């Protein structure tokens, strides 16, 4: 929704690329081939929906990509320490 | 201290998705195509988007 002409400055590859990393972050993948698996449609389904939220939340791809990168970043360190030892 | 709490979604959801390794899924995978920022974003994307 909303007319946001910056959509011409962002491609499917860019968005799907970020979304792919989202999966890497939401799903600590045991192998890169799990990223092209049937479980992947689910993982990427989340990633697409989340990226879509921030895509629409932002007023530039630069912005959407920045703020989304911040969320993924905190998630990755969250997962690492939660797995390592925090509780 | 609470599974909800707010802000604790990170821990919960990521733990749930951690255990999602032993889960099935659907049937499809993914797709891409294009090229604008990723192309020479290499070092920046690694650092800021976080490819650990």
UniProtKB/Swiss-Prot annotation, chain A:
PTM per Swiss-Prot/TrEMBL: Methylation of the KIX domain by CARM1 blocks association with CREB. This results in the blockade of CREB signaling, and in activation of apoptotic response. Sumoylation negatively regulates transcriptional activity via the recruitment of DAAX.
Superkingdom of the organism of origin: Eukaryota
Asymmetric dimethylarginine modified-residue sites: 15, 39
Subcellular location: Cytoplasm; Nucleus
N6-acetyllysine modification, residue list: 71
Ranges for domain KIX: 1-80
Subunit field text: Part of a complex composed of MSX3, CREBBP/CBP AND EP300/p300; the interaction with MSX3 decreases histone acetylation activity. Interacts with DHX9 (via N-terminus); this interaction mediates association with RNA polymerase II holoenzyme and stimulates CREB-dependent transcriptional activation. Interacts (via transactivation domain and C-terminus) with PCNA; the interaction occurs on chromatin in UV-irradiated damaged cells. Found in a complex containing NCOA2; NCOA3; IKKA; IKKB and IKBKG. Probably part of a complex with HIF1A and EP300. The TAZ-type 1 domain interacts with HIF1A.
The protein's role, per its UniProt record: Acetylates histones, giving a specific tag for transcriptional activation. Mediates acetylation of histone H3 at 'Lys-18' and 'Lys-27' (H3K18ac and H3K27ac, respectively). Also acetylates non-histone proteins, like DDX21, FBL, IRF2, MAFG, NCOA3, POLR1E/PAF53 and FOXO1. Binds specifically to phosphorylated CREB and enhances its transcriptional activity toward cAMP-responsive genes. Acts as a coactivator of ALX1. Acts as a circadian transcriptional coactivator which enhances the activity of the circadian transcriptional activators: NPAS2-BMAL1 and CLOCK-BMAL1 heterodimers.
Name of the molecule in the record: Histone lysine acetyltransferase CREBBP
Shown residues in whole-protein numbering: 586 to 672 of 2441
């Amino acid at each position: 929704g909303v007319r946001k002409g910056w959509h011409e400055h962002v491609t499917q590859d860019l968005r799907s690329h970020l979304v792919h990393k989202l999966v890497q972050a939401i799903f600590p993948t045991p192998d890169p081939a799990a990223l092209k698996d049937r479980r992947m449609e689910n993982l990427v389904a989340y990633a697409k929906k989340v990226e879509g939220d921030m895509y629409e939340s932002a007023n530039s791809r630069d912005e959407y990509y920045h703020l989304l990168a911040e969320k993924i970043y905190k998630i990755q360190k969250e997962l690492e320490e939660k797995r390592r030892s925090r509780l | 201290g609470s599974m909800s709490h707010y802000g604790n979604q990170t821990l919960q959801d990521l733990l749930t998705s951690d255990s999602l390794s032993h889960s099935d899924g659907g049937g499809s995978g993914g797709g891409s195509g294009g090229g604008s920022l990723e192309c020479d974003m290499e070092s920046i994307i690694r650092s800021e988007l976080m490819d650990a």
